[PDB]
Every structure is written in C-alpha cells, then in structure tokens.
Amino acid sequence: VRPVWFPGNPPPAHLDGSLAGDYGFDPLFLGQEPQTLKWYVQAELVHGRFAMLGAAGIILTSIGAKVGLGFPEWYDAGKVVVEKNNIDFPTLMVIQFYLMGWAETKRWYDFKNPGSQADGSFLGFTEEFKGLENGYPGGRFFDPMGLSRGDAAKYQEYKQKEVKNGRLAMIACLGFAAQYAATGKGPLDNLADHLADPNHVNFATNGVSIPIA
Amino acid sequence: DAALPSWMPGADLPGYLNGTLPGDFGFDPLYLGQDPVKLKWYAQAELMNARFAMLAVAGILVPELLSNIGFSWPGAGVAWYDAGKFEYFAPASSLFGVQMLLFAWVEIRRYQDFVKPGSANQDPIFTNNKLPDGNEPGYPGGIFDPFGWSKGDIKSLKLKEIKNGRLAMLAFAGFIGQAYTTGTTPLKNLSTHLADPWSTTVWQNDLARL
Amino acid sequence: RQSWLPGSQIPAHLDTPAAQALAGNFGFDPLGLGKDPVALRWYQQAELIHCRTAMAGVAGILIPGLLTKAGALNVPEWYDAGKVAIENSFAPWGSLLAVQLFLCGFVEAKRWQDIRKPGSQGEPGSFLGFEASLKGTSELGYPGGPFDPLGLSKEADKWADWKLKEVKNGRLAMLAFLGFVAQKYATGAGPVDNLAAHLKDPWHVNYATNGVSLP
Amino acid sequence: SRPLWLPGSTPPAHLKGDLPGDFGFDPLGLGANAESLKWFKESELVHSRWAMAAVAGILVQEIVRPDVFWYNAGKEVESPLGPLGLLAVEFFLMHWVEVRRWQDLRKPGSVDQDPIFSQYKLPPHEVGYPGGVFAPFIPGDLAELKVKEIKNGRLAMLAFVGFVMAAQVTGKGPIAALQEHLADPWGTTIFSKAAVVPGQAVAPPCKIPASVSYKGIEIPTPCFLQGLWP
Ligand code: CLA
Ligand code: CLA
Numbered sequence: 119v120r121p122v123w124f125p126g127n128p129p130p131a132h133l134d135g136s137l138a139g140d141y142g143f144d145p146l147f148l149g150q151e152p153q154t155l156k157w158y159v160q161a162e163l164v165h166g167r168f169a170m171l172g173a174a175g176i177i178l179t180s181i182g183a184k185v186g187l188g189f190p191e192w193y194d195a196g197k198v199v200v201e202k203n204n205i206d207f208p209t210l211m212v213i214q215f216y217l218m219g220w221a222e223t224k225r226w227y228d229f230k231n232p233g234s235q236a237d238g239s240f241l242g243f244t245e246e247f248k249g250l251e252n253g254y255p256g257g258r259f260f261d262p263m264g265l266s267r268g269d270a271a272k273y274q275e276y277k278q279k280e281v282k283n284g285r286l287a288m289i290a291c292l293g294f295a296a297q298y299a300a301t302g303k304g305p306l307d308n309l310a311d312h313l314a315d316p317n318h319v320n321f322a323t324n325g326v327s328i329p330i331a
Numbered sequence: 332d333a334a335l336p337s338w339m340p341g342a343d344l345p346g347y348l349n350g351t352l353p354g355d356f357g358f359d360p361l362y363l364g365q366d367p368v369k370l371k372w373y374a375q376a377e378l379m380n381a382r383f384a385m386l387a388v389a390g391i392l393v394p395e396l397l398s399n400i401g402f403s404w405p406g407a408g409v410a411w412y413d414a415g416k417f418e419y420f421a422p423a424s425s426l427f428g429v430q431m432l433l434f435a436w437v438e439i440r441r442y443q444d445f446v447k448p449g450s451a452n453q454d455p456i457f458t459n460n461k462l463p464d465g466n467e468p469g470y471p472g473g474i475f476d477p478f479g480w481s482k483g484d485i486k487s488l489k490l491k492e493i494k495n496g497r498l499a500m501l502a503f504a505g506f507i508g509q510a511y512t513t514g515t516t517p518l519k520n521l522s523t524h525l526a527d528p529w530s531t532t533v534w535q536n537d538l539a540r541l
Numbered sequence: 542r543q544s545w546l547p548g549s550q551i552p553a554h555l556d557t558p559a560a561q562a563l564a565g566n567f568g569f570d571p572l573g574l575g576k577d578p579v580a581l582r583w584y585q586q587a588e589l590i591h592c593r594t595a596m597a598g599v600a601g602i603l604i605p606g607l608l609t610k611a612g613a614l615n616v617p618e619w620y621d622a623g624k625v626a627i628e629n630s631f632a633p634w635g636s637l638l639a640v641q642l643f644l645c646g647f648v649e650a651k652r653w654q655d656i657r658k659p660g661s662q663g664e665p666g667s668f669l670g671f672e673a674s675l676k677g678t679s680e681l682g683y684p685g686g687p688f689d690p691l692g693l694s695k696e697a698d699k700w701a702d703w704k705l706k707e708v709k710n711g712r713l714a715m716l717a718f719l720g721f722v723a724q725k726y727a728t729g730a731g732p733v734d735n736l737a738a739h740l741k742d743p744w745h746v747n748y749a750t751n752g753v754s755l756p
Numbered sequence: 757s758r759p760l761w762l763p764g765s766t767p768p769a770h771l772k773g774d775l776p777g778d779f780g781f782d783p784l785g786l787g788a789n790a791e792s793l794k795w796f797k798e799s800e801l802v803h804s805r806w807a808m809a810a811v812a813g814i815l816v817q818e819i820v821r822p823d824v825f826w827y828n829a830g831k832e833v834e835s836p837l838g839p840l841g842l843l844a845v846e847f848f849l850m851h852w853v854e855v856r857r858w859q860d861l862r863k864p865g866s867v868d869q870d871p872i873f874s875q876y877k878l879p880p881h882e883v884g885y886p887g888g889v890f891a892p893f894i895p896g897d898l899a900e901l902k903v904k905e906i907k908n909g910r911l912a913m914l915a916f917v918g919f920v921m922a923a924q925v926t927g928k929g930p931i932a933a934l935q936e937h938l939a940d941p942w943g944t945t946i947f948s949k950a951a952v953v954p955g956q957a958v959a960p961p962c963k964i965p966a967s968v969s970y971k972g973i974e975i976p977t978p979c980f981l982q983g984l985w986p
C-alpha cells in the first residue's frame with residue numbers, strides 16, 4: 119500500500135514503513151539485522167549530508183565559473199587554494215582529521231550507547247549532545263532553528279525530504295566524478311553543452327560511455 | 332544564589348559564594364571553588380596577591396609620578412623593569428638572601444595561623460606582647476592595625492580592600508603586558524593615551540607592531 | 542565516572558572497589574593489561590615510578606631549558622649533557638654508572654621486597670633504628686615517613702586530590718619525555734627551540750612538515 | 757478571522773493571531789517551537805528597528821548630501837577621531853547594550869534597574885518592548901502602534917535589501933535609481949537589465965569595485981552574490 123522502488127514486488131520483512139525515505143530497496147538483504155540496519159541508516163544519512171554539502175559546493179563554485187568570476191572548477195580548487203594561499207597541505211589534512219575525528223568519535227560512541235555523550239564530560243554541555251534518534255541528533259546546536267520540535271508531522275516530512283535530497287545529491291556527486299572522468303571539464307559547462315545542442319552532446323557521443331561508437 | 336550584588340546581574344550563581352567571603356559577586360565561571368578547602372586557600376591567596384599588588388602599583392606609579400614631576404633621588408626616572416640593574420649599597424644576591432630569610436620568618440608565621448587560627452599571636456622573645464584573640468586568618472589585627480580601625484564597619488572595609496586589590500592586580504598585569512609590548516613607562520603610556528586618545532588604542536599599537 | 546571515552550564500556554576490573562578507589566582511574570585499559578588484580582597492583586607501582594622519574598627528568602630538561610633560552614644559565618641540550626659534564630667530572634661514566642647501580646639497586650630491591658610483601662622493611666632489627674619509619678602507609682606506592690618531610694599526608698581529606706594531581710602531572714611528563722625523544726629524532730633541534738619554531742609559524746612548522754607523517 | 761498573507765489560506769497552528777503582525781505567514785514551520793519563537797520575535801523586532809533607522813538614514817543622507825554615496829559613506833567620512841577609535845567606542849558601547857537586551861531576553865524579570873542611579877527602575881514591561889524611559893509621550897493605542905511598528909519595519913527590512921541590490925547593480929543611491937525608473941520605466945527594471953534563457957545568461961555588470969584602498973590596508977567589497985545574479 120506504500121510506494122516501492124520496484125512496483126509489484128512486496129517490500130522485505132525487515133523494512134516496514136517507519137524510516138524516512140523508505141521504498142523497500144534492499145535486494146541484497148544487507149540491513150536484514152536490526153542493528154546493522156541501525157548502522158546503515160546512520161551511514162546513508164551522513165553520506166547524504168556530505169553529498170548535499172558537496173553538491174551545493176560544486177554547483178555554487180561552477181556558477182562562479184563560466185559567468186566571469188575568478189573561481190576555479192571543483193577539480194582545480196584543491197591546488198589553487200593551497201598555492202594562492204600559502205597553506206602547507208599535510209597540516210591542513212591533519213587539522214581536518216583532528217577536528218573531524220573528534221566530531222566523528224562523538225557520533226561513534228553515540229551509536230554504541232545512545233544515552234551517552236551527554237553527561238557533561240565535554241565542556242559543560244548536557245542536553246545539547248543528547249541525540250534525539252539515529253542520525254537525527256538535534257538539541258540546541260544541531261537544530262538551532264528548532265524544527266525537530268513543534269509539529270511532528272512536518273518534522274517527518276522534513277525527514278523524508280532530507281533523505282530524498284540526500285539520495286539525489288549522492289547520485290549527483292557520483293555523477294560529477296563521471297562527468298569529469300569522461301569529458302574533462304566543468305559540470306555546468308557540461309550542462310550548457312547539453313543545452314546548446316540537446317542531441318549529439320550527450321553521454322552516448324562522448325566516446326567513453328559506450329565503446330561501440 | 333540570593334539578592335547579592337552580581338558580576339552579571341540576572342544570571343544564576345553557583346551558591347557557594349553567598350556573601351561570607353569579603354567582596355564576592357559570584358564571579359567564578361570555571362567553578363574552581365567547589366571544594367571549600369580549596370576556597371579558603373583561594374581567599375587567602377587573593378588577599379596575598381592583592382596586597383602585594385597594591386604595594387606593587389603604589390611602588391611603580393609613585394616613583395614614576397615623582398620622577399616625571401622631578402625630585403632629586405639617586406634612583407629617579409629608572410624603570411621598574413630596570414631597577415634590578417640599578418646598583419645599591421649591596422649587590423642583589425645579599426638583598427635576595429636577606430629577603431628570603433625575613434620572609435621565611437614572616438610567611439611561616441602567617442601560615443601557622445592559616446593552619447590553626449589564633450595560635451601565632453604571641454612573640455617569641457617578648458612573651459608579653461600579643462595580638463588580640465578572635466582574629467581570622469588574613470586579618471591579624473593588633474599591631475597590624477595600629478590606627479584603631481576595624482572596630483566597626485569591618486565588612487565594608489574588607490570589601491574596599493578586596494576591590495582596590497583586584498583593581499591593583501589588574502593594574503600590575505597591565506604593567507607587565509603594557510611594558511612588554513610598547514616597552515615604555517606605564518605612566519608614559521597614560522601620557523600618550525592622553526596626548527591623542529583615539530590615535531593610540533591598544534589595537535593601533537598592535538597593528539603598528541604587527 | 543569521568544571516563545577517557547564517555548561512551549565506552551569501562552573494563553569491569555577497572556570498576557571494582559579496589560580499582561575505582563585508585564589514583565587517576567579514568568577507565569583506560571583497552572588492551573586488558575591489568576585483568577589480574579595483582580597485575581594491576583604491580584602496574585600501579587610501575588605507573589607511579591615511571592611517572593615520578595619522568596617528572597624529575599622532564600623538570601631537569603625544561604626548567605634549565607627555559608632558564609637557558611631566557612639567560613642566567615648555560616645548561617646544554619639534554620641530548621648533549623652526557624657529552625659535556627663527563628669532562629667536568631671526577632669520574633668516567635662506567636665507574637659512575639657502577640656506583641649508580643649499587644646505590645639505586647639498594648633502594649630498588651627494598652622497594653621490590655616491600656611491593657611483594659607490605660610492611661616488610663619495618664620489621665625490627667633491620668636497620669639501626671631507622672627501619673621503624675619504613676612500613677610505608679596502609680597502601681603501597683605512597684610510603685611517606687621520611688619521604689613526606691613537609692607533612693602533606695596527615696590530612697585524610699584532599700588526599701585523593703594530591704594523588705590525582707601527582708598521577709596527572711606524571712602522565713603528562715611521561716608524554717613529555719616521549720615527546721622530547723621523538724621531537725629530537727624528527728628535526729634534530731631542542732625542545733624549547735621546537736616550541737619557538739612552532740610559535741613563530743604554527744601553520745607551517747609542525748610534524749606535518751617532516752618525514753614522519755609520510756603518506 | 758484575521759487578515760492573512762494569503763487570504764484563502766489557513767494559518768499554522770502555532771500562529772494564532774496572538775502576536776502583533778501575526779498574519780499566518782510561516783510556511784517553513786520556523787515558529788513551531790515556543791521557545792524559539794521568542795528569539796525570532798526579538799530578532800524580527802531588532803532587524804526591523806535597525807532597518808527602519810538605516811532606511812531613514814540612507815534617504816535623509818541622500819536628500820541632504822547628494823554628493824556622497826551611502827555605500828561609499830564609510831570610506832570618505834574622514835573623521836578626526838581615527839578609524840579604530842570609532843570601532844572601539846562602538847564595540848564597548850554596543851557590547852554593553854546588546855548584553856543588556858540579551859539578558860532581558862534570557863531572564864525577563866532580572867534586568868530593569870539603572871545600576872548607577874538605583875532610584876530609577878524600568879517598569880515591568882514585555883520582552884522586546886522596554887518602554888518607560890525609551891518611550892515617552894506614546895500616542896494612542898499601544899497595540900496599534902505595536903502593529904504599525906512591525907509593518908513599517910518589515911517594509912524597511914525589504915527596503916534595505918532593495919537599497920543594497922540597487923546600489924550593487926546601478927551603483928547609485930535610492931533616489932537616483934528611482935530617477936532611473938522614472939526617467940525610463942520600461943528599460944530600467946531588473947528584467948530589462950538581466951535575463952537567463954536556457955543557453956546563455958545575461959547578468960548585470962557590477963558597479964562596485966572589488967576593493968577600496970582606505971588608508972593602507974584594503975577592504976574587499978564582495979558584490980554580494982555576483983554570478984548567482986540573473
Ligand atoms: C587597571 C586596568 C588597566 C588600565 C586602566 C589600562 C590603561 C591603559 N592601557 Mg592597559 N592593560 C591592562 C590593564 C589596564 N590598562 C591589562 C590587564 C593588560 C594585559 C592584557 C593591558 C595591556 C595593554 C596593552 C598591550 C596596551 C595597553 C594600553 C593602555 C593605554 C591605552 C588604553 C588602551 O589602548 O586600551 C587598553 C585596554 C585594555 C588592554 C583592557 C584593559 C581591561 C581592564 C582591566 C578593564 C577596564 C577596567 C575598568 C573597568 C576601567 C578602567 C579605568 C579605571 C581603573 C579608572 C591605557 C593607559 C596601550 C598603550 O600603552 O597605549 C597607550 C597598549 O598598547 N594595555
Ligand atoms: C514608524 C515606526 C515605528 C513605530 C510605529 C514605533 C512604535 C512603537 N515603538 Mg518603536 N522604534 C522604531 C520605530 C517605530 N516604533 C525604531 C526605528 C526604533 C529604533 C530607534 C525603535 C525603538 C523602540 C524602542 C527601544 C522602544 C520602542 C517602543 C515603541 C512603542 C511605544 C513608543 C511610541 O509611541 O512610538 C510611536 C512612534 C511613532 C509615532 C513614530 C514617529 C516617527 C517620527 C515621525 C520620526 C521618524 C523619522 C525620524 C527623523 C527618524 C530618526 C530618529 C532616530 C532614528 C534618530 C510603539 C509600539 C517602546 C516600547 O515598546 O514600549 C513598550 C520602546 O521601549 N521602539
């Protein structure tokens with residue numbers, strides 16, 4: 119009675135409709151156990167979060183290119199900011215790994231113990247790192263607008279919208295890499311190449327996607 | 332945790348700063364004085380750092396005030412960070428040894444009254460002179476109060492002492508940080524901030540030094 | 542109980558009343574080294590003495606190091622003070638190490654025998670009246686007696702405070718000595734020289750600008 | 757049965773006409789939390805009051821000094837009191853007032869009394885609405901003025917972004933942009949200056965330099981969202 123990724127086939131038993139963005143897509147039965155599924159919900163969420171941030175990053179910095187601004191492409195922005203700004207690179211990598219190892223191990227021991235990370239062991243914060251549910255921490259820091267409390271039905275709507283935009287941002291970030299490994303130029307240059315001629319500047323005329331050209 | 336004066340009027344206060352200690356306003360955001368056995372030591376330490384800082388500010392400003400006005404001292408116009416190099420009737424090692432013996436007497440006399448109050452109020456050699464009983468540590472009284480004060484309105488006097496002392500501790504930290512950056516006399520820093528108050532803030536001296 | 546990781550299951554042999562009442566217990570034994578209670582009793586002694594010798598050594602490195610870079614001492618580097626001070630020395634190093642191992646082994650074997658059986662050295666007739674102050678306290682690792690001249694143990698309040706201050710300053714000094722060795726190997730300079738090199742350019746002069754974080 | 761932002765609509769359940777200016781407009785659900793709606797009401801009032809003072813300032817500054825331009829007015833003012841002395845006095849004098857207002861927000865029955873003139877105390881007012889000495893000779897109904905303030909304030913919040921996005925596209929103050937729109941209405945709109953078709957995007961050119969000199973160290977002036985413009 120609910121929509122499924124493949125109409126006709128029933129959804130599997132471990133996958134009733136309670137998660138955000140559930141459509142019964144597990145042909146390989148990877149999340150059959152409830153705890154491995156509890157871990158993969160967290161994984162799909164945070165991959166979607168980083169992919170939404172990344173896709174907005176590529177799209178904004180490619181609107182910055184081709185209009186006339188001095189922005190590079192996304193595959194060139196790694197070099198140009200460690201060379202234009204005198205940034206030593208392995209220390210930037212180690213500072214990234216320090217800050218995000220902190221922020222990640224906090225989450226990694228919230229998964230192992232949901233009521234933890236909230237006993238004031240950190241700098242005096244008790245309810246702010248409480249965690250509302252799996253992959254949805256909330257509180258005063260992770261929800262400063264406070265949209266996780268109020269109308270709960272609209273919060274379930276926002277949960278499903280987050281998962282939807284996160285899925286197609288993961289697909290977009292998988293597609294930017296393929297647009298770059300195939301064509302070799304910017305993504306919004308590939309869009310304007312597909313728009314200047316809708317035929318013949320698609321993937322089937324790139325010489326790489328189909329080898330039977 | 333009462334109607335006491337507060338450093339931030341409106342916020343909560345942790346409650347162990349009710350008003351029994353002189354001149355408290357609840358300012359302990361790091362929550363250092365949770366154990367009261369640390370808080371008694373911190374009260375005596377604030378009194379001692381405050382009284383030595385009040386002597387420090389009175390001994391840095393007043394020689395520089397009478398140097399910029401101008402008297403005829405053997406040491407006049409010398410910096411407080413340069414008075415150690417100035418020579419005297421004795422070299423500074425003998426000065427330091429006499430200091431570290433006289434204060435070795437006085438500080439242990441004070442500490443024995445810290446660890447047992449009322450138990451150091453008798454002289455060693457003249458066992459007829461005494462301080463009057465009923466004194467608290469940090470405030471001996473007796474010959475240390477020769478002008479007959481503290482015989483009424485003692486809480487306001489302790490609050491005046493701790494406020495002038497906290498101000499003078501900030502002033503001596505100012506003397507350090509304000510003689511280490513610009514390298515001048517702390518009264519000749521007031522002279523420049525009164526010469527043109529807008530064209531020398533700390534930010535413009537920082538940015539000119541950067 | 543203020544653990545080293547807030548979300549971890551603390552090992553159950555660090556949650557016993559014998560081990561929770563121990564100095565500096567933050568629940569840290571991820572490799573199970575103290576699962577036997579007498580193994581933990583031995584390693585508590587090993588931690589106290591590895592940390593007290595490290596506090597003495599790291600003080601003897603960076604107190605004359607900071608008093609060398611600020612003047613009014615000329616103490617050399619800690620990795621150079623064996624090359625020098627053997628010329629300004631009444632003895633060569635071999636005889637000095639032999640006298641060292643005798644004077645230190647006489648101490649360390651008495652400590653060995655007191656760890657294997659507490660109050661051993663307090664039995665009468667051992668020394669010439671000196672053995673009476675050698676029972677230590679009721680717990681091992683903290684003898685007192687002649688080793689508490691200022692008398693900070695006669696309190697029974699704030700005593701766990703002094704324990705935990707000793708253990709935390711000692712763990713920090715053990716990390717500082719492992720530092721001193723490693724920051725000598727990595728760049729060949731001194732520790733206060735490395736501190737000045739970090740403080741003059743933090744975002745370019747660190748352990749990501751040498752060959753030891755190599756990809 | 758109050759008037760709404762869209763007349764046929766139903767207002768959300770957290771917007772029940774209690775607050776002034778409550779016309780049922782919160783489509784993103786941001787005023788659902790009761791604790792967060794107080795902070796949002798305070799920030800709407802403060803954004804609105806700063807925007808009204810700013811719009812009146814830019815308009816009066818243009819009608820009394822047509823020579824100088826308000827986007828450039830922080831660059832050519834040439835005060836005798838230095839560049840950083842102004843910022844230091846503003847920093848301390850605003851860090852006082854803002855922490856006072858913030859502590860009013862956190863505990864409303866805490867901060868009323870003048871700390872150095874203790875006989876003077878502010879009456880037990882409403883959060884966001886101090887009154888007493890900030891408000892002498894209030895005319896007429898206080899709820900009617902409380903609605904008029906939010907209406908003129910929302911209009912001025914839109915007007916300040918109008919001033920900024922005029923002055924970054926035409927580079928002229930908001931009477932000279934109005935004189936452009938009155939001298940030639942059909943060709944001085946934003947749809948006249950710009951259009952994006954699927955195949956090319958004609959953005960308007962900048963009228964703000966990428967930097968200004970200003971006494972040695974140069975300040976970058978980001979033309980807001982250039983490139984993302986139509
Ligand atoms: C008793 C407090 C006190 C006072 C009155 C002064 C006064 C002064 N300082 Mg100073 N300073 C202080 C503490 C103080 N300082 C402390 C604790 C430090 C260490 C961080 C410094 C570090 C410092 C530097 C590095 C410099 C100054 C400078 C100055 C002068 C110009 C003012 C300025 O640029 O703002 C400086 C203001 C501060 C650094 C903040 C001080 C914070 C205080 C404690 C709070 C305010 C106290 C109180 C509410 C009001 C004071 C007035 C009252 C006592 C009569 C001026 C004469 C500059 C100078 O010499 O140029 C002429 C300069 O370059 N100060
Ligand atoms: C037209 C917009 C407008 C309106 C209707 C109100 C209305 C109100 N305000 Mg409000 N306010 C405004 C703008 C406005 N304000 C702005 C821009 C600020 C920031 C300066 C404030 C700051 C403010 C505070 C801090 C307080 C109020 C309060 C009040 C209430 C009672 C005061 C009163 O009678 O005001 C009636 C207002 C008018 C009749 C408007 C007259 C406008 C004249 C014609 C001058 C406008 C042009 C002028 C040249 C601008 C420059 C002046 C100034 C910016 C230097 C009432 C709800 C008080 C309150 O809530 O009490 C409970 C209170 O404490 N307001």
Ligand SMILES: CC(/C=C/C=C(C)/C=C/[C@@]12O[C@]1(C)C[C@@H](O)CC2(C)C)=C\C=C\C=C(C)\C=C\C=C(C)\C=C\[C@@]12O[C@]1(C)C[C@@H](O)CC2(C)C
Nearest residue numbers: 570571572573574591594595598601619622715716718719
């Ligand atoms: C003693 C010590 C150093 C003492 C230094 C001395 C005396 C130095 C003396 C000198 O410098 C001077 C004075 C002057 C110089 O001229 C001469 C020398 C001679 C050079 C360092 C100890 C240094 C000791 C260190 C660093 C120990 C680190 C151990 C760790 C981190 C283990 C952790 C774990 O074991 C647990 C806790 C639980 C398990 O489950 C998990 C794991 C992780 C296995």
